[PDB]
């Protein structure tokens with residue numbers, strides 16, 4: 001099978017680990033355990049192709065910012081995650097887009113914009129503003145809930161599709 | 167760690183599997199079970215470097231000759247094995263050297279000449295003739311016994327050395 | 333479940349997607365012979381001069397349509413000189429279920445070559461793995 | 466076994482071969498804090514709508530010199546929501562012995578950070594792996 005190197009990035013607490021663990025283990029992590037950097041290997045079937053996903057779940061906390069160049073070099077596609085009830089996380093997205101573009105020296109690195117925690121009622125980031133940002137970058141926008149599992153497969157599978165069409 | 171793709175080739179019954187299994191499992195296979203094609207993954211330390219050896223143990227029987235192009239394309243170094251009590255196996259060595267050279271399109275593919283079954287008293291291939299052949303090719307000659315374990319590590323480790331100096 | 337002529341056509345299709353010396357062959361009354369690969373992923377207890385050493389191997393075997401999982405397991409344990417209780421081991425098919433690749437334990441009475449033929453040559457679709465409980 | 470100033474120099478050497486936010490830090494009387502990675506290689510029994518699904522993960526953890534193997538095991542089982550008996554699991558160091566890379570079971574009373582410091586930053590020299598018996 002072909003292998004895909006996926007990296008999950010975004011501000012601390014947006015649900016990067018929760019999304020990853022929903023894909024890997026098929027359950028929701030309620031606990032908030034800040035990540036330093038974790039990696040996963042998951043075999044999947046996407047549109048009839050068997051794929052090995054190597055998934056890097058990264059730190060949103062600033063103390064680990066120095067690790068970014070390293071993982072941005074090696075990653076093939078990026079899930080750029082914010083939480084729809086956290087305006088600051090949405091503001092932080094462009095910073096990730098820009099650092100990836102710098103490190104990889106490309107303006108079309110495979111990326112998906114993910115608005116997570118869509119199970120929550122108290123939304124502060126309007127879907128239209130997120131759709132606008134994704135359109136600006138030329139990338140897909142998907143809302144997910146690591147809790148309900150809504151959009152989780154679509155987010156990762158869309159990213160793999162973005163990579164294999166690149 | 168760095169990975170090395172090793173391929174073990176030579177006429178049927180010379181001890182290709184026995185040598186491989188001595189390296190992998192640290193024991194001697196007395197049974198004669200002709201190979202179709204088997205593969206092994208073994209982590210080792212060679213001169214202080216940790217290496218992953220992917221080892222392909224190939225068929226000496228003619229019925230599987232069609233599989234050679236495929237494994238010769240993918241292999242990085244070749245242990246070319248004959249048995250010191252089998253003159254025909256020694257005559258067959260040049261055929262392997264030539265097919266590898268053809269398939270890889272190179273006259274310096276990493277190779278080691280291995281004279282196996284050196285535990286046996288009834289020798290029919292003189293060591294000098296084998297030394298002469300290896301000198302002709304510009305490769306090392308090592309005598310091994312899969313039975314006693316004599317030379318087994320040196321053969322594989324020499325091959326890895328040949329690859330990393332290439 | 334299935335027709336013999338169905339098996340005949342299945343073998344011909346299989347073989348078009350495979351090398352000649354690795355193809356399946358039809359025999360008497362819808363029986364056939366052919367090849368599988370089994371991935372052994374075992375931890376072997378070892379003594380120094382506690383600790384284990386990995387056995388990580390893919391063994392290619394020539395078997396028939398009547399060869400059972402039980403036969404495949406015993407043959408591998410004997411070939412790799414594994415002395416543990418054979419009933420501590422199981423053969424699994426790695427297959428697609430629900431977008432997920434899962435490992436399903438095989439019945440000791442199952443026939444791996446039949447599974448292989450039905451799946452086609454691609455190990456991405458079905459692979460066999462031998463594991464200790 | 467060892468000197469505190471020995472530990473101080475060992476930490477400084479360690480950190481020169483590692484990124485800044487991933488370095489070790491000296492604390493009171495020769496204690497220290499630092500990072501390890503544990504490779505979880507587990508088979509998880511699953512139900513469809515028998516079968517297992519792999520959990521293949523490398524978890525990076527911030528721990529101290531007094532953190533025990535027992536603590537590392539329990540913390541991982543809880544983090545990955547593994548409900549099996551914790552005594553069915555063991556932590557191994559993958560290390561060099563006799564030109565061979567072997568896995569050695571750790572005592573539940575051992576201190577992984579100490580092992581990590583002594584080995585240096587290179588996971589090729591020492592890696593940790595969590596396995597079910």
Ligand SMILES: Nc1nc2c(ncn2[C@@H]2O[C@H](COP(=O)(O)OP(=O)(O)NP(=O)(O)O)[C@@H](O)[C@H]2O)c(=O)[nH]1
Pocket residue numbers: 010011012013014015016017018019029030031032033034035036058059060061116117118119120144145146147148
């Ligand atoms: N309601 C809801 N909560 C979620 C969702 N995703 C994550 N959370 C919750 O948000 C908290 C933080 O999630 P976590 O996955 O740890 O975030 P992170 O982005 O990995 N954090 P860090 O960057 O520090 O590693 C947890 O308490 C988690 O249960 C979601 O889709 N819905």
Ligand SMILES: Nc1nc2c(ncn2[C@@H]2O[C@H](COP(=O)(O)OP(=O)(O)NP(=O)(O)O)[C@@H](O)[C@H]2O)c(=O)[nH]1
Pocket residue numbers: 176177178179180181182183184185195196197198199200201202224225226227282283284285286310311312313314
């Ligand atoms: N005395 C002795 N016998 C050996 C040695 N190596 C292999 N043999 C014996 O020679 C026979 C054939 O060995 P085997 O490893 O199966 O050879 P092969 O080259 O792999 N055969 P094939 O090409 O058909 O797969 C066995 O009966 C084996 O025990 C050796 O170093 N010394």
Ligand SMILES: [Mg+2]
Pocket residue numbers: 016017018033034035057058059060
């Ligand atoms: Mg996280």
Ligand SMILES: [Mg+2]
Pocket residue numbers: 182183184199200201223224225226
């Ligand atoms: Mg053989």
